[PDB]
Amino acid sequence: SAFDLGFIRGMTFGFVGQHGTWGTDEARASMRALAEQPFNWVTLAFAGLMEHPGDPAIAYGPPVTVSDDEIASMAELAHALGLKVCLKPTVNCRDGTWRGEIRFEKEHGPDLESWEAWFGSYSDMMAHYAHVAKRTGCEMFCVGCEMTTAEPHEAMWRETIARVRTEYDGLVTYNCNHGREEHVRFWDAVDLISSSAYYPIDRWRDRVPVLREVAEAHEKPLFFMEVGCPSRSGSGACPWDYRHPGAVCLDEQARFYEAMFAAMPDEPWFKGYMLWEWPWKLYPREAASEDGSYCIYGKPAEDVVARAFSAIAN
Ligand SMILES: OC[C@H]1O[C@@H](O[C@H]2[C@H](O)[C@H](O)[C@@H](O)O[C@@H]2CO)[C@@H](O)[C@@H](O)[C@@H]1O
Numbered sequence: 001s002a003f004d005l006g007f008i009r010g011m012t013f014g015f016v017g018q019h020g021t022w023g024t025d026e027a028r029a030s031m032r033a034l035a036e037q038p039f040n041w042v043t044l045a046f047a048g049l050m051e052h053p054g055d056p057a058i059a060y061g062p063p064v065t066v067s068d069d070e071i072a073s074m075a076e077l078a079h080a081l082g083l084k085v086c087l088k089p090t091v092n093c094r095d096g097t098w099r100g101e102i103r104f105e106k107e108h109g110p111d112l113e114s115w116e117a118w119f120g121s122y123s124d125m126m127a128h129y130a131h132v133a134k135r136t137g138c139e140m141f142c143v144g145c146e147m148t149t150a151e152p153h154e155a156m157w158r159e160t161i162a163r164v165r166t167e168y169d170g171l172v173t174y175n176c177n178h179g180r181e182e183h184v185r186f187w188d189a190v191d192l193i194s195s196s197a198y199y200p201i202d203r204w205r206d207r208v209p210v211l212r213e214v215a216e217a218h219e220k221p222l223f224f225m226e227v228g229c230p231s232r233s234g235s236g237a238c239p240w241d242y243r244h245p246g247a248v249c250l251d252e253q254a255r256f257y258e259a260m261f262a263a264m265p266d267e268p269w270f271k272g273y274m275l276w277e278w279p280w281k282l283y284p285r286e287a288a289s290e291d292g293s294y295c296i297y298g299k300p301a302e303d304v305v306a307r308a309f310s311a312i313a314n
């Protein structure tokens with residue numbers, strides 16, 4: 001199933017999945033526009049909310065996130081447009097702190113500000129959405145994203161994953177941050193290794209050997225659950241950084257994709273690309289030259305990716 005998996009030509013849709021936004025005419029129009037492109041996968045991504053990086057409570061569902069029925073509506077539409085769907089619940093902090101820096105002073109204590117408490121909340125969230133993934137026939141489920149500070153809590157990640165397996169029979173991945181592929185201890189517990197592969201333009205050429213080594217060592221396919229670059233000046237040096245300032249620069253985004261596609265080998269361990277990202281409210285192509293986001297629609301990167309993905313498809 002993991003070994004046999006068709007090469008992934010994917011796009012992430014709809015983040016952060018704010019309540020009500022996917023049930024709109026706009027979101028429907030955006031998903032249709034996505035499906036005009038040579039993608040075989042879409043990821044429905046959304047974030048629950050922590051107040052602070054040291055708070056064990058996670059808010060998800062309405063009024064924060066899209067409802068379960070909004071998720072189902074988008075999954076149904078995607079499937080009817082011929083796409084396979086990955087469901088990706090994650091968590092953000094209201095103060096803007098990256099989820100890769102969540103931290104607790106205590107390991108244990110269900111009613112304390114502890115790792116145990118936080119994983120209790122997170123595990124309930126994952127079980128909730130693994131069940132939604134089953135309901136909606138999602139072909140993949142992503143159990144976490146860029147949780148660098150949480151990753152050493154290996155027993156707790158294994159408990160979380162096991163719970164997902166009781167609720168969901170499809171492909172399961174965990175999405176680590178770039179630079180963590182060779183660090184995560186629990187790849188044996190998922191079906192596919194995946195990362196947020198925001199490697200700078202000039203590093204693709206020399207990062208490939210470690211990606212190859214990780215995949216081959218774990219006898220599991222590896223793919224990128226996030227990859228992209230904003231269309232802003234200099235962003236190619238820090239494609240992970242959504243806050244990087246810069247004038248709109250369409251070619252810089254294209255150069256990122258050209259560098260990535262040049263470097264990635266045609267070898268069976270590598271299973272492809274889930275691009276970051278596509279908004280639920282899509283700008284018209286006439287406005288694309290003034291857009292500095294990760295979206296490739298209406299920009300030269302659209303053609304770079306479509307040329308690459310059409311060639312893979314054919
Ligand atoms: O990779 C996407 C996330 O990147 C974060 O920034 C990290 C970066 O990834 C590297 O670990 C590093 O150069 O240090 C940074 C932390 O300051 C954040 O920009 C997140 O919002 C991204 O999701």
Ligand SMILES: OC[C@H]1CNC[C@@H](O)[C@@H]1O[C@@H]1O[C@H](CO)[C@@H](O)[C@H](O)[C@@H]1O
Pocket residue numbers: 015016092146196226239240241242276277
């Ligand atoms: O920096 C690009 C990605 C890297 N991985 C996680 C993801 O959060 C990040 O994207 C941005 O996410 C924030 C909300 O977390 C959003 O405001 C931005 O506009 C990007 O989608």
